[PDB]
Structure 1
Amino acid sequence: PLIVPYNLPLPGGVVPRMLITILGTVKPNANRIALDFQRGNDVAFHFNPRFNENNRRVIVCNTKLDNNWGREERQSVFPFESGKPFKIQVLVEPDHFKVAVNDAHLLQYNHRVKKLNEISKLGISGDIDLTSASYTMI
Structure 2
Amino acid sequence: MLIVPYNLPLPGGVVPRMLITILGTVKPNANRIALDFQRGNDVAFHFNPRFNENNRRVIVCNTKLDNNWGREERQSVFPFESGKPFKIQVLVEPDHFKVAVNDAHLLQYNHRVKKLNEISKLGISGDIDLTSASYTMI
TM-score band, normalised by the shorter chain? over 0.9
Aligned residue pairs total 137
Shift of 1:29: 1.1
Shift of 1:85: 0.2
Partner of 2:26: 26
Runs of 4+ in 1 over 6 A off after TM superposition: none
Shift of 1:135: 0.4
Shift of 1:31: 0.2
Q: For residue 63 of structure 2, give the secondary structure of its aligned residue in structure 1.
A: strand
Distance 1:100 1:121 in 2: 20
Q: For residue 51 of structure 1, give the secondary structure of its aligned residue in structure 2.
A: strand
C-alpha deviations, 1:56-94, integer Å up to 9, x for none? 000000000000000000010000000000000000000
Gaps of 5+ in 1: none
Over the matched positions of the two proteins, sequence identity in percent amounts to 100
Shift of 1:13: 0.3
TM-score normalised to the size of structure 2? 0.99
Q: For residue 60 of structure 1, give the secondary structure of its aligned residue in structure 2.
A: strand
Distance 1:40 1:88 in 2: 23
Shift of 1:34: 0.1
Distance 1:108 1:83 in 2: 26
Distance 2:75 2:39 in 1: 24
C-alpha deviations, 1:27-77, integer Å up to 9, x for none? 001000000000000000000000000000000000000000000000100
